[PDB]
Structure formats: C-alpha cells, structure tokens
From Swiss-Prot:
Thioredoxin domain residues: 12-124
A single BP term in Gene Ontology: negative regulation of IRE1-mediated unfolded protein response
Keyword Endoplasmic reticulum recorded: yes
Taxon lineage: Eukaryota, Metazoa, Chordata, Craniata, Vertebrata
Name this protein carries in UniProt: Protein disulfide-isomerase A6
Top-level taxon: Eukaryota
Keywords per UniProt: Cell membrane, Chaperone, Disulfide bond, Endoplasmic reticulum, Isomerase, Membrane, Phosphoprotein, Redox-active center, Repeat, Signal
Disulfide-bonded cysteines: C47-C50
Coiled coil: none
Shown segment, full-protein numbering: 16 to 132 of 440
Modified residues (Phosphoserine): S121
Gene name in the database record: Pdia6
Subunit structure: Part of a large chaperone multiprotein complex comprising DNAJB11, HSP90B1, HSPA5, HYOU, PDIA2, PDIA4, PDIA6, PPIB, SDF2L1, UGGT1 and very small amounts of ERP29, but not, or at very low levels, CALR nor CANX. Interacts with MICA on the surface of tumor cells, leading to MICA disulfide bond reduction which is required for its release from tumor cells. Interacts with ITGB3 following platelet stimulation. Interacts with ERN1; the interaction is direct. Interacts with EIF2AK3.
Subcellular location: Endoplasmic reticulum lumen; Cell membrane; Melanosome
C-alpha cells in the first residue's frame, strides 16, 4: 500500500478514558521512559473480578491523570508483559518508581479512591515534582 494504519483491538478500557493503553511496544517509552510514577494494572478481559475493576481503575487514572500515569495492560493479550514481571493471578497492580525495571507489589485498596491515595503517597517519595 501507500500509508499504514492501525485498528481497534480488544480491551476493557479505551484510549478515550483517562487510562493509558499500555502495550509491549510502548510500555518502555511510556513507563520505562517516564521519570515520574506509573501505575500498571494487569487485568483480564476474560476474568470476572477484573472486568469489575474497569471503573475502579479508571477513576484513579482520572485523578492521577497528571499525578501518576495510570495505564493498563491486558495480561491475557500482553501475556509477555505480565509474565515478564511475574503476573500469574489477576487482577495484579504494579507500581513503577524507584526501579522502573522492578515495580512494587501494590497492596493498597483497589478502589478508584484508594488508588488515588496510593499513587500520591508513592509520588512524594520521588523527587519528580508535580
């Protein structure tokens, strides 16, 4: 052809929302290349509890939109990203800050509210103002 393009793929979330669609092609240029804080959640469009974390996760992405980059990786699809880290049971949230190569196991609340408080608490720890 002359010009290439892309199409809409499977995913409980959407670029429209505040959640950034993280993929095994930009995950690095999105998170690894983000001195700031990043919150990646490994969900599954085939699981239950996961599909119920769409609104909860999105909410946090809206508030932490400018605070903490809250993305989303389809463990089912990006099986490479999830496993590459150690994701076996979703939902599985991961915090990126100190070591972009080795995130922290998010234990805080998985609610749009809790997430907001979690992302912040972590942000402070980092020098990256904003």
């Amino acid at each position: 052809g002359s010009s290439g393009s892309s199409g809409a793929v499977s995913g409980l979330y959407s670029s429209s929302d505040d959640v950034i669609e993280l993929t095994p092609s930009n995950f690095n240029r999105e998170v690894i290349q983000s001195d700031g804080l990043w919150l990646v959640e490994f969900y599954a469009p085939w699981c239950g509890h996961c599909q119920r974390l769409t609104p909860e996760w999105k909410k946090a992405a809206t508030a932490l939109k400018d605070v903490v980059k809250v993305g989303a990786v389809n463990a089912d699809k990006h099986q490479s990203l999830g496993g590459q880290y150690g994701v076996q049971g979703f939902p599985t949230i991961k915090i990126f800050g100190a070591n972009k190569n080795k995130p922290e196991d998010y234990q805080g609340g998985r609610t749009g509210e809790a997430i907001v408080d979690a992302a912040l608490s972590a942000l402070r720890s980092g020098p990256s103002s904003g």
